[PDB]
Design an enzyme around this catalytic site. Structure first.
Site, PDB file in Angstrom:
ATOM      1  N   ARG A 109     -13.488  -4.361  16.686  1.00 41.78           N
ATOM      2  CA  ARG A 109     -13.571  -2.915  16.506  1.00 41.78           C
ATOM      3  C   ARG A 109     -12.587  -2.254  15.537  1.00 41.78           C
ATOM      4  O   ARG A 109     -12.639  -1.038  15.359  1.00 41.78           O
ATOM      5  CB  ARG A 109     -13.442  -2.220  17.852  1.00 41.78           C
ATOM      6  CG  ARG A 109     -14.624  -2.394  18.752  1.00 41.78           C
ATOM      7  CD  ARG A 109     -14.327  -1.689  20.054  1.00 41.78           C
ATOM      8  NE  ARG A 109     -13.588  -2.543  20.973  1.00 41.78           N
ATOM      9  CZ  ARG A 109     -13.039  -2.119  22.105  1.00 41.78           C
ATOM     10  NH1 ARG A 109     -13.129  -0.836  22.444  1.00 41.78           N
ATOM     11  NH2 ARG A 109     -12.393  -2.975  22.888  1.00 41.78           N
ATOM     12  N   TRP A 278     -19.666  -9.760  11.171  1.00 41.81           N
ATOM     13  CA  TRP A 278     -19.399 -11.137  10.783  1.00 41.81           C
ATOM     14  C   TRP A 278     -18.718 -11.910  11.915  1.00 41.81           C
ATOM     15  O   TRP A 278     -18.037 -11.337  12.782  1.00 41.81           O
ATOM     16  CB  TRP A 278     -18.576 -11.209   9.493  1.00 41.81           C
ATOM     17  CG  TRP A 278     -17.289 -10.475   9.569  1.00 41.81           C
ATOM     18  CD1 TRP A 278     -16.127 -10.907  10.153  1.00 41.81           C
ATOM     19  CD2 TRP A 278     -17.015  -9.173   9.045  1.00 41.81           C
ATOM     20  NE1 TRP A 278     -15.150  -9.951  10.022  1.00 41.81           N
ATOM     21  CE2 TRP A 278     -15.671  -8.873   9.353  1.00 41.81           C
ATOM     22  CE3 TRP A 278     -17.775  -8.226   8.350  1.00 41.81           C
ATOM     23  CZ2 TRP A 278     -15.074  -7.674   8.981  1.00 41.81           C
ATOM     24  CZ3 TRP A 278     -17.180  -7.040   7.988  1.00 41.81           C
ATOM     25  CH2 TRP A 278     -15.840  -6.776   8.297  1.00 41.81           C
ATOM     26  N   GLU A 283     -17.131 -18.159  17.964  1.00 40.44           N
ATOM     27  CA  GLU A 283     -18.474 -17.807  18.423  1.00 40.44           C
ATOM     28  C   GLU A 283     -19.500 -18.885  18.133  1.00 40.44           C
ATOM     29  O   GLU A 283     -20.409 -19.099  18.924  1.00 40.44           O
ATOM     30  CB  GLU A 283     -18.932 -16.536  17.762  1.00 40.44           C
ATOM     31  CG  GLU A 283     -18.322 -15.295  18.342  1.00 40.44           C
ATOM     32  CD  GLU A 283     -18.896 -14.056  17.704  1.00 40.44           C
ATOM     33  OE1 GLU A 283     -18.345 -13.623  16.673  1.00 40.44           O
ATOM     34  OE2 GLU A 283     -19.913 -13.538  18.223  1.00 40.44           O
TER      35      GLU A 283
HETATM   36  C1  HEM Z   1     -17.300  -7.022  11.803  1.00 42.85           C
HETATM   37  C2  HEM Z   1     -16.786  -8.007  12.552  1.00 42.85           C
HETATM   38  C3  HEM Z   1     -17.032  -8.133  14.078  1.00 42.85           C
HETATM   39  C4  HEM Z   1     -16.429  -9.055  14.839  1.00 42.85           C
HETATM   40  C5  HEM Z   1     -15.404 -10.111  14.360  1.00 42.85           C
HETATM   41  C6  HEM Z   1     -16.883  -8.900  16.204  1.00 42.85           C
HETATM   42  C7  HEM Z   1     -16.473  -9.680  17.264  1.00 42.85           C
HETATM   43  C8  HEM Z   1     -17.037  -9.747  18.524  1.00 42.85           C
HETATM   44  C9  HEM Z   1     -16.882 -10.825  19.483  1.00 42.85           C
HETATM   45  C10 HEM Z   1     -16.067 -12.118  19.263  1.00 42.85           C
HETATM   46  C11 HEM Z   1     -17.565 -10.508  20.584  1.00 42.85           C
HETATM   47  C12 HEM Z   1     -17.690 -11.392  21.839  1.00 42.85           C
HETATM   48  C13 HEM Z   1     -19.165 -11.765  21.980  1.00 42.85           C
HETATM   49  C14 HEM Z   1     -19.395 -13.141  22.567  1.00 42.85           C
HETATM   50  O1  HEM Z   1     -18.393 -13.864  22.856  1.00 42.85           O
HETATM   51  O2  HEM Z   1     -20.603 -13.503  22.731  1.00 42.85           O
HETATM   52  C15 HEM Z   1     -18.184  -9.219  20.360  1.00 42.85           C
HETATM   53  C16 HEM Z   1     -18.967  -8.495  21.226  1.00 42.85           C
HETATM   54  C17 HEM Z   1     -19.534  -7.271  20.939  1.00 42.85           C
HETATM   55  N1  HEM Z   1     -19.591  -6.633  19.691  1.00 42.85           N
HETATM   56 FE1  HEM Z   1     -18.328  -6.933  18.077  1.00 42.85          FE
HETATM   57  N2  HEM Z   1     -17.783  -7.846  16.238  1.00 42.85           N
HETATM   58  C18 HEM Z   1     -17.912  -7.353  14.945  1.00 42.85           C
HETATM   59  C19 HEM Z   1     -18.749  -6.304  14.584  1.00 42.85           C
HETATM   60  C20 HEM Z   1     -19.494  -5.521  15.442  1.00 42.85           C
HETATM   61  C21 HEM Z   1     -20.416  -4.440  15.109  1.00 42.85           C
HETATM   62  C22 HEM Z   1     -20.778  -3.977  13.657  1.00 42.85           C
HETATM   63  C23 HEM Z   1     -20.914  -3.978  16.279  1.00 42.85           C
HETATM   64  C24 HEM Z   1     -21.899  -2.816  16.537  1.00 42.85           C
HETATM   65  C25 HEM Z   1     -21.929  -1.751  15.735  1.00 42.85           C
HETATM   66  C26 HEM Z   1     -20.309  -4.724  17.360  1.00 42.85           C
HETATM   67  C27 HEM Z   1     -20.512  -4.532  18.718  1.00 42.85           C
HETATM   68  C28 HEM Z   1     -20.265  -5.407  19.767  1.00 42.85           C
HETATM   69  C29 HEM Z   1     -20.678  -5.202  21.140  1.00 42.85           C
HETATM   70  C30 HEM Z   1     -21.445  -4.015  21.748  1.00 42.85           C
HETATM   71  C31 HEM Z   1     -20.191  -6.429  21.908  1.00 42.85           C
HETATM   72  C32 HEM Z   1     -20.375  -6.696  23.406  1.00 42.85           C
HETATM   73  C33 HEM Z   1     -21.670  -7.462  23.602  1.00 42.85           C
HETATM   74  C34 HEM Z   1     -21.917  -7.625  25.077  1.00 42.85           C
HETATM   75  O3  HEM Z   1     -21.533  -6.708  25.870  1.00 42.85           O
HETATM   76  O4  HEM Z   1     -22.507  -8.681  25.453  1.00 42.85           O
HETATM   77  N3  HEM Z   1     -19.470  -5.646  16.806  1.00 42.85           N
HETATM   78  N4  HEM Z   1     -17.829  -8.786  19.106  1.00 42.85           N
HETATM   79  C1  LIG Z   2     -23.298 -15.136  27.375  1.00 44.58           C
HETATM   80  N1  LIG Z   2     -24.067 -15.383  26.144  1.00 44.58           N
HETATM   81  C2  LIG Z   2     -24.649 -16.734  26.191  1.00 44.58           C
HETATM   82  C3  LIG Z   2     -25.147 -14.387  25.998  1.00 44.58           C
HETATM   83  C4  LIG Z   2     -24.792 -13.359  24.943  1.00 44.58           C
HETATM   84  C5  LIG Z   2     -25.472 -13.340  23.725  1.00 44.58           C
HETATM   85  C6  LIG Z   2     -25.145 -12.394  22.756  1.00 44.58           C
HETATM   86  C7  LIG Z   2     -24.146 -11.456  23.011  1.00 44.58           C
HETATM   87  O1  LIG Z   2     -23.789 -10.521  22.076  1.00 44.58           O
HETATM   88  C8  LIG Z   2     -22.417 -10.553  21.717  1.00 44.58           C
HETATM   89  C9  LIG Z   2     -22.091  -9.983  20.357  1.00 44.58           C
HETATM   90  C10 LIG Z   2     -22.456  -8.683  20.004  1.00 44.58           C
HETATM   91  C11 LIG Z   2     -22.121  -8.206  18.734  1.00 44.58           C
HETATM   92  C12 LIG Z   2     -21.414  -9.007  17.836  1.00 44.58           C
HETATM   93  C13 LIG Z   2     -21.071  -8.535  16.572  1.00 44.58           C
HETATM   94  C14 LIG Z   2     -20.381  -9.364  15.690  1.00 44.58           C
HETATM   95  C15 LIG Z   2     -20.021 -10.651  16.095  1.00 44.58           C
HETATM   96  N2  LIG Z   2     -19.334 -11.461  15.248  1.00 44.58           N
HETATM   97  N3  LIG Z   2     -20.362 -11.092  17.328  1.00 44.58           N
HETATM   98  C16 LIG Z   2     -21.045 -10.303  18.197  1.00 44.58           C
HETATM   99  C17 LIG Z   2     -21.388 -10.780  19.458  1.00 44.58           C
HETATM  100  C18 LIG Z   2     -23.466 -11.481  24.225  1.00 44.58           C
HETATM  101  C19 LIG Z   2     -23.791 -12.424  25.193  1.00 44.58           C
END
Ligand code: HEM
Ligand SMILES: CN(C)Cc1ccc(OCc2ccc3ccc(N)nc3c2)cc1
Ligand code: HEM
Ligand SMILES: CN(C)Cc1ccc(OCc2ccc3ccc(N)nc3c2)cc1
Ligand SMILES: C[C@H](O)[C@H](O)[C@H]1CNc2nc(N)[nH]c(=O)c2N1
Ligand SMILES: C[C@H](O)[C@H](O)[C@H]1CNc2nc(N)[nH]c(=O)c2N1
Ligand SMILES: [Zn+2]
Lengths: 407, 411
Positions: A109, A278, A283
């Site tokens: 974020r 990205w 991940e």
């Molecule tokens: C630009 C670089 C970004 C990085 C490095 C990043 C990184 C991450 C990571 C590592 C997670 C954990 C997800 C997992 O382990 O499956 C995550 C979750 C999440 N990301 Fe970010 N993200 C980025 C951009 C964004 C953008 C552009 C959005 C939306 C506008 C966003 C929204 C979210 C949301 C809503 C979650 C939670 C998903 C859930 O509740 O399952 N991210 N992000």
């Molecule tokens: C628990 N997992 C197996 C299910 C699961 C799949 C996608 C999910 O979305 C995570 C998520 C959302 C937004 C992202 C934006 C950027 C980024 N590098 N990773 C991001 C990762 C969360 C959980």
């Protein structure tokens, strides 16, 4: 009531007041914590709208101004009339950026205000959606110099005219149940790889087959579409020392683009809003290669390292998990594709935390998700206390379309 | 009300009814989660219901709920309270309590062992010297020449809070840490403040990198006194690596018995402010926290140097890489010397089994995910994808202010 949070590595203490604004609920009580659970009318709509518009006009230093009041009046009017309402583009953008800003689970974020918003609200067909999606993918990829983006399809009306991207991410690898018993390709995507064929896909039955888009517009049946390969940037994975690594036949896509979430702004419900940024290295490498219910190639990797795989106490899984992640980062940086390491991203987050506590008075955070799935305690977030609470606008989970669709 | 937790790696779903027997607060509310906050003189008024609650659990566990034994015991306790403003636990009750406190320790991954706990009753103790004796026998018993046994020693309960028994050490065995004039730290950076107090109390510090600290013990609210655990009682393991021969030359060694001594046992309203307990190490506790945390021995970098890693860009994962090797060395040194130790994969596997067993047979198992998940290689241990309800049960182990912050100095 004015809570504080201590970083234990550094003694730094931030005070949190932003949480007092918190509007939605967590799943917790005074008696039970659920912090580790995955997913805990005109009358409701107007308060929702006012709250949003109040924070919007406050954010532009025109709180209580004529424009503000008139707008609040204008929306209030359209609400009484049309039962819903439409957001000015400026509001749409502010809204999108802020749902990301409030995404408590997102370590990335710090980048939250550099979001490219694509207003796809004029869309009416799956084909249209496809055109909008390809455009997003191409823009966000930018030849490997990735940019954050979100594409927003028409808001929900009355749950009948729902726009939905059935894919969980725009770009994912197919996964097939073998008659052998095991699983070929990506196991996460098995049920989806079925529905695609169940809806008519002609699967190349390979390993890294890019899944087809299954777009659903205006509540209609969903249609299959195939992303032009020249738009799907991939990185062949190779280790900077172990030259037997490339032999493992591995690559991964550069664009993480989550598509199954519901975006909520001022009470309005954008049920299709694929967004992307990205990858953090882990991940793909900790999670997408090495989870038991994923590619699960750990054993084969360490096998090729001739590590003692007899007892857990050799920590072979750990040694391997580390090399794999070193390779992932190595290949991406080599192919000039954007990626961040988990040390860098966590560092950036602590700064972003400090920034939000300073300029905004707090920053909701979900420790369980912010801490990387490897090397947790040697990242600065591990020792960082975090307050978790839900703010609006937000990204929310939503039921899988195939559990809901009325055909 | 039923509550479900789902393991996302295996789709196993469990159902918690136990959380209904939860009284104490979590810190959480419906609008905020304190799930990752580290830390979120009792009258006859609030004592008896706490006591009844305890005795009710106790008599259910021995299948004697409502028995005459049960009812008389309630009465006996009642009268002892309104008369003496406190009460005494029977030996049977004290043991049950200590075990259940461990069993309720929602942050402890080791809980599978909870029922096999040796309880030493030191409620007859009256002096620091008596404390030193009890503690010494604890350490000898628990150490068992490297074949570690779980034990807890229980000193007299708090009375008016003016006559507290406390062990001022955070663990019975721990290495001194010395802040140098140049800013560097000699020994364990985690122990500097305590080391200072010790010195002020007359301890003659060797000022070496691995000096076992003295016990600072307090009896009946008196000023604490210093005692040197005899060294033959302190089992240590020199740290070497199985493939890296330059590792031994880093001059490392760790003690074998982890024995936490600053917590507070609560049983049936009674507060045991001195209750040192011990089990055995999970490798990561020493390997990831005790050497590698930036606020600890920080040989992360020196191990990295000796491995000739690429310490330039962090994306080389040199920190990650060194961390793994250090934990390999810790486990290897311990096993070679037949000093009991468990690796994080083994411990987490065990926990999941314990947890599932507890849900089926007890109706749940309070667990703090933030603490249960190991501090390295999180997602490749089975607890990572395990959902966990967290809540507070009594008996329990509680934190308590450092005694040097609250203690009134006699002189
Ligand atoms: C630009 C670089 C970004 C990085 C490095 C990043 C990184 C991450 C990571 C590592 C997670 C954990 C997800 C997992 O382990 O499956 C995550 C979750 C999440 N990301 Fe970010 N993200 C980025 C951009 C964004 C953008 C552009 C959005 C939306 C506008 C966003 C929204 C979210 C949301 C809503 C979650 C939670 C998903 C859930 O509740 O399952 N991210 N992000
Ligand atoms: C628990 N997992 C197996 C299910 C699961 C799949 C996608 C999910 O979305 C995570 C998520 C959302 C937004 C992202 C934006 C950027 C980024 N590098 N990773 C991001 C990762 C969360 C959980
Ligand atoms: C026998 C082998 C045992 C193992 C392997 C074990 C393992 C652990 C570990 C790894 C932690 C996290 C420690 C940290 O990172 O700071 C922990 C926490 C804890 N353990 Fe266990 N433990 C064992 C025995 C015991 C015993 C005998 C007791 C008490 C009678 C106990 C009570 C606790 C408590 C109360 C916590 C939470 C500490 C806190 O709230 O800060 N454990 N345990
Ligand atoms: C931030 N720290 C100074 C606080 C802190 C340090 C050690 C702690 O140890 C907890 C603890 C308690 C009992 C244990 C029993 C066995 C074992 N292997 N580790 C155990 C670990 C708890 C908190
Ligand atoms: C901020 C956070 O709550 C704190 O640093 C916790 C995180 N998890 C932990 N987990 C274990 N096992 N031990 C710890 O000391 C901590 N510290
Ligand atoms: C059980 C737990 O809630 C679940 O496995 C969570 C744990 N932490 C996570 N953390 C991240 N970043 N991503 C995840 O999918 C999960 N899964
Ligand atoms: Zn909570």
């Amino acid at each position: 009531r004015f809570l504080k949070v201590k970083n234990w590595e550094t003694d730094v203490v931030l005070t949190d007041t932003l949480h007092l604004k918190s509007t939605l609920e967590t799943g917790c009580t005074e008696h039970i914590c659920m912090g580790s659970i995955m997913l805990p009318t005109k009358d409701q709509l107007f308060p929702l709208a006012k709250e949003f518009l109040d924070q919007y006009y406050s954010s532009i230093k025109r709180f209580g101004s004529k424009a503000h009041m008139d707008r609040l009046e204008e929306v209030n009017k359209e609400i009484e009339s049309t039962s819903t309402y439409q957001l000015k583009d400026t509001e749409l953008i502010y809204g999108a950026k802020h749902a990301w800003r409030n995404a408590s689970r997102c370590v990335g974020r710090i980048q939250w205000s550099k979001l490219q918003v694509f207003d796809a609200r004029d869309c009416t067909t799956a084909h249209g959606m496809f055109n909008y999606i390809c455009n997003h993918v191409k823009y966000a990829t930018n030849k490997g110099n990735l940019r954050s983006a979100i594409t927003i399809f028409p808001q929900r009306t009355d749950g009948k005219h729902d726009f939905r991207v059935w894919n969980s991410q725009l770009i994912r690898y197919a996964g097939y149940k073998q008659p052998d018993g095991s699983t070929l390709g990506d196991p996460a995507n098995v049920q989806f790889t079925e529905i695609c064929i169940q809806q008519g896909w002609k699967a190349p039955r390979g390993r890294f087959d890019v899944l087809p888009l299954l777009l659903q517009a205006n509540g209609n049946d969903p249609e299959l579409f195939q992303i032009p390969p020249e738009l799907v940037l991939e990185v062949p994975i190779r280790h900077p020392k172990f030259d037997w690594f490339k032999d493992l036949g591995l690559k991964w896509y550069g664009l993480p683009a989550v598509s199954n979430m519901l975006l909520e702004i001022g009470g309005l419900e954008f049920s299709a809003c694929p967004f992307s940024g990205w990858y953090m290295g882990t991940e793909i490498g900790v999670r997408d290669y090495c989870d038991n219910s994923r590619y699960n190639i750990l054993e084969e990797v360490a096998k090729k390292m001739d590590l003692d795989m007899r007892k857990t106490s050799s920590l072979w899984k750990d040694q391997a998990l580390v090399e794999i992640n070193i390779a992932v980062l190595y290949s991406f940086q080599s192919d000039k594709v954007t990626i961040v390491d988990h040390h860098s991203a966590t560092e950036s987050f602590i700064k972003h935390m400090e920034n939000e506590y300073r300029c905004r008075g707090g920053c909701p955070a979900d420790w369980v998700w912010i801490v990387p799935p490897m090397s947790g305690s040697i990242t600065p977030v591990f020792h960082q206390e975090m307050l978790n609470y839900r703010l609006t606008p937000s990204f929310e989970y939503q039921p899988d379309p195939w559990n809901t669709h009325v055909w």
